[model samples]
Target: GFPCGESCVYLPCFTAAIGCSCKSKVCYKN
Candidate 1:
């Protein structure tokens, strides 16, 4: 998950990713 493009983002360390709620360095390819 390197090419973030215009759909990837890193949520807060205490929050979750856009579509995924996994509490980690989750990468959302939306």
Candidate 2:
């Protein structure tokens, strides 16, 4: 993922920091 300014569909930095596994249902299905 890449940065898309202050207004982006997805924030890779933040996602990477906190982890974006929440976006995937399979990740939580365990």
Candidate 3:
């Protein structure tokens, strides 16, 4: 991965319309 203001992180969340899902931390180094 390229240099980022933040790092990739796995986060679990639940959505009432979509159920549980896995998400990632997104960032851009400016």
Candidate 4:
């Protein structure tokens, strides 16, 4: 995957996360 600025990865299996956004190298998940 790419950056959230480049790719909006929607992780549906986000059980402990908030938004499915990724940036540069990491996902903004819990």
Instruction: Return the top candidate by lDDT.
Output: 4
Write candidate 4's Cα lDDT for 1-30 as tens digits: 322223334443332243445554345443
User: By TM-score, who's the top model here?
Assistant: 4
Clashes of 4: 1
Which of 1 and 3 is ahead in lDDT? Answer: 3
Candidate 4, TM-score vs. the true structure?
A: 0.24
| RMSD, candidate 2, Å | 9.7
Candidate numbers, best lDDT first, in rank order: 4, 3, 1, 2
Q: In model 3, which runs have C-alpha deviations exceeding 4 angstroms?
A: 1-18, 25-30
Off by over 4 Å in 4: 1-17
Estimate, for each residue in 1-30, the C-alpha lDDT of model 2 and write its tens digit.
423223223433343334433332222111
TM-score per model over all chains: 0.15, 0.17, 0.16, 0.24
Q: Per-residue lDDT for 1-30 in model 1, tens only?
A: 322222223443232233433223453233
Clashes of each: 0, 0, 0, 1
* Model 4 residue 23 CA deviation in Å: 0.3
Please list the C-alpha lDDT of all candidates, in the order they appear. Answer: 0.32, 0.31, 0.35, 0.38
